[PDB]
């Protein structure tokens, strides 16, 4: 059956147009351990459901930043 599923809530800055959003969605879809996500392109709110046994929140946030080439600024919301 399915495994552990944790959630990470993020504020994303740097989405200036529809192209930037699709770039970000592409990064998330290719990131190992990401199971689902919801992105509001206008507010920058991003929720990510990930398997904590495959990727940690630490590695997940770092991965998006690295894959984004500094275009996206990530802040974790509590």
Author numbering: 21 to 98
Question: What does the publication say?
Answer:
The small unsaturated hydrocarbon is detected by a family of receptors (ETRs) located in the membrane of the endoplasmic reticulum, which rely on a monovalent copper cofactor to detect this hydrocarbon. The copper-transporting P-type ATPase RAN1 (HMA7), located in the same membrane, is known to be essential for the biogenesis of ETRs. The AlphaFold2 model also predicts three domains at the N-terminal end, all with ATX1-like folds (henceforth referred to as MBDs) and a Cα atom RMSD < 1 Å with respect to each other. MBD3 may function as an anchor, stabilizing the RAN1-ETR1 complex while MBD1 and MBD2 are involved in a copper relay system.
To corroborate the AlphaFold2 23,28 prediction of a third ATX1-like fold domain at the N-terminus of RAN1, we expressed, purified, and analyzed this predicted domain by X-ray crystallography. The obtained crystal of the RAN1 MBD3 from Arabidopsis thaliana belongs to the orthorhombic space group P21221 with unit cell constants a = 50.755 Å, b = 51.481 Å, c = 62.722 Å. The crystal structure was determined by molecular replacement (MR) using the AlphaFold2 23,28 prediction of RAN1 (AlphaFold DB: Q9S7J8) cut to the sequence of MBD3 as a template. The structure was refined to a resolution of 1.98 Å with Rfree = 23.5% and Rwork = 19.2%, and MBD3 of RAN1 was modeled to completeness. The asymmetric unit comprises two molecules with an overall structural similarity (mutual RMSD = 0.355 Å; RMSDs to the AlphaFold2 model = 0.501/0.641 Å). The obtained crystal structure of MBD3 is consistent with the structure predicted by AlphaFold2 (Cα atom RMSD < 1 Å). However, the third domain (MBD3), which is the most distant from the N-terminus and the closest to the transmembrane domain, lacks the typical CBM. Notably, MBD3 also showed copper-binding, with an EC50 MBD3 = 9.7 ± 1.1 µM.
